[PDB]
Write a protein that binds this ligand. Structure first.
Ligand code: HEM
Ligand SMILES: NC1=N[C@@]2(c3ccc(F)cc3F)CO[C@@H](c3cn[nH]c3)C[C@H]2CS1
Ligand code: NA
Ligand SMILES: [Zn+2]
Ligand SMILES: [Zn+2]
Ligand SMILES: [Zn+2]
Ligand SMILES: [Zn+2]
Length: 457
């Protein structure tokens, strides 16, 4: 019956405040936000006990009132914010299966991704020896991969509409944070104000509008007489079969939500991680050279990298995992909710409680990692040089809600990272201050703005 302790009654720096509250109270501490009860879980033990051991009771999502503006409904919640039930499970299984059918885990997508990497490399080279922010180009290349899986196409890096879609998605990501989002979600009746409802998610609404245009175009080119060439076509085919069935999650409202979630996720996660990767490679040239050494020993500077090479490249694999661990791009994960009363680390957590998984505290747990606050590839290496992955490596969280994009992320991260280090050498621009290894929080944590030089090899 003993509830977790907590302070009795900034969101632009939330992961920072939680760690201060962490060491103060403990691993499992409670805290009050408006009329919403919240329990924050810290360290591998607490997170694992909640998401795995009590996985059936913590796989649910809290209600998010402001999503009513985006056309949400019982069979229209997509996957991400979908309540733990049939609608979530139908869409989740669909995404996992459809991605797998489209060549995820095969040589097919593998060669497509490394084709986009070639386009990315060419864009890098066009900047000569000049210093530049590589973020925009990383977004485009990574976005084309997920666009290829969902929309069945890629976009040119100068495409006006592609650029706007990426820009809106990035601005929409900022709207996923802030303090205003919290108040409207804490007390929903403030949303009744018509003048207020049009500002809260101004860019996310713009993104959806821009996406609708592309979907409409895609509908026209869809050939239902042929097997689905991408995820959207597969969804449409299921939507046709589901005509007359009110229980199906395959509807128009859900099509745009699923595609939006997948595309934007496909973009801002992998590219931010890659942005962390390049930053850490110019801050640690020694590590960069050792990776390039392994590439030349396994792949060479000639042919494009393949997923078969990763098993023979433990150091590069270690570096990539360390980029994810140090990068820590989803510090507080995604909020869960208890659908039943549970027991975590002795304390009692009642049904309906919002759970916050502090994944940061797992990736940088001092009890597990040797040098949690340092960039240290040997976190994933033994003395022999073998790749080892600790249990505390949970950047994709855990349990029934664990990131479904992890297989895509894994192959994208390896294929893009290796291809970029295979042909380029990155460094801090001479005359410029040492780029901070601290990041900026906005739900996702991106590295602070930096520039680099990309000289070909
Ligand atoms: C470095 C890359 C990525 C990281 C670190 C990451 C991390 C995460 C995390 C922490 C969650 C929350 C899991 C939870 O609720 O406990 C999540 C969920 C999710 N991610 Fe990712 N992700 C990445 C890439 C992707 C990609 C590429 C896609 C899609 C193409 C994707 C789609 C999703 C979806 C749909 C969910 C919700 C799953 C569900 O609610 O059942 N993610 N991810
Ligand atoms: N709630 C959402 N937030 C994300 C997101 C939300 C709103 C936007 F405008 C753009 C985004 F990218 C950020 O986190 C992504 C993510 C994927 N795995 N982990 C995070 C998933 C996307 C779409 S749904
Ligand atoms: Na995992
Ligand atoms: Zn198509
Ligand atoms: Zn460092
Ligand atoms: Zn070994
Ligand atoms: Zn080259």
């Amino acid at each position: 019956g003993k509830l977790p302790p907590g302070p009795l009654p900034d969101f632009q720096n939330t992961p920072y405040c939680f760690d201060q509250l962490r060491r103060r109270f403990g691993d499992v501490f409670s805290l009050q936000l408006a009329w919403t009860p919240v329990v924050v879980l810290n360290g591998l033990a607490a997170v694992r006990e909640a998401l795995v051991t009590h996985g059936e009771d913590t796989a649910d999502r809290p209600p998010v009132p402001i999503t009513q503006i985006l056309g949400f409904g019982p069979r229209s919640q997509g996957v991400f914010l979908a309540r733990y039930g049939p609608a979530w499970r139908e869409q989740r299984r669909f995404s996992v299966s459809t991605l797998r059918n489209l060549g995820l885990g095969k040589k097919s997508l593998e060669q497509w991704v490394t084709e986009e990497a070639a386009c990315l490399c060419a864009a890098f080279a066009n900047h000569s020896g000049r210093p530049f922010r590589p973020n925009g180009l990383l977004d485009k290349a990574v976005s084309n991969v997920i666009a290829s899986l969902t929309c069945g196409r890629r976009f040119e890096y100068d495409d006006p509409r592609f650029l706007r879609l990426l820009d809106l998605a990035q601005e929409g990501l900022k709207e996923e944070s802030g303090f205003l989002r919290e108040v409207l979600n804490a007390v929903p009746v403030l949303l009744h104000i018509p003048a207020l409802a049009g500002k809260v998610l101004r860019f996310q609404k713009a993104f959806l509008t821009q996406l609708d245009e592309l979907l409409t175009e895609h509908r026209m080119t869809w050939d239902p007489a042929q097997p689905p060439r991408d995820l959207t076509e597969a969804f449409l085919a299921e939507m046709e079969k589901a005509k007359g069935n009110p229980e199906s999650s395959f509807n128009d409202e859900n099509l745009r939500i699923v595609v939006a979630d997948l595309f934007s996720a496909g973009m801002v996660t992998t590219s931010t991680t890659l942005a962390w990767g390049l930053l850490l490679m110019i801050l640690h040239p020694d590590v960069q050279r050792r990776v390039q050494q392994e590439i030349d020993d396994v792949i060479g500077q000639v042919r494009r990298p393949e997923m078969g090479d990763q098993a023979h490249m433990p150091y590069t694999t270690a570096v990539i995992h360390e980029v994810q661990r140090f990068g820590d791009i989803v510090p507080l994960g995604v909020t869960h909710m208890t659908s039943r009363d549970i027991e975590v680390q002795g304390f009692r957590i009642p049904k309906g409680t919002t759970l916050i998984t502090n994944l940061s505290s797992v990736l940088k747990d001092e009890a597990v990692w040797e040098k949690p606050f340092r960039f240290h590839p040997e976190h994933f290496l033994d003395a022999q040089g073998h790749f080892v992955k600790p249990e505390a490596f949970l950047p994709f969280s855990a349990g029934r809600r664990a990131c479904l994009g992890e297989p895509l992320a894994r192959m994208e991260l390896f294929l893009f990272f290796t291809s970029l280090l295979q042909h380029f050498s990155f460094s801090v621009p001479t005359g410029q201050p040492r780029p901070s290894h601290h990041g900026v929080f906005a739900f996702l944590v991106s590295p602070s703005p930096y520039e680099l030089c990309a000289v070909p090899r």
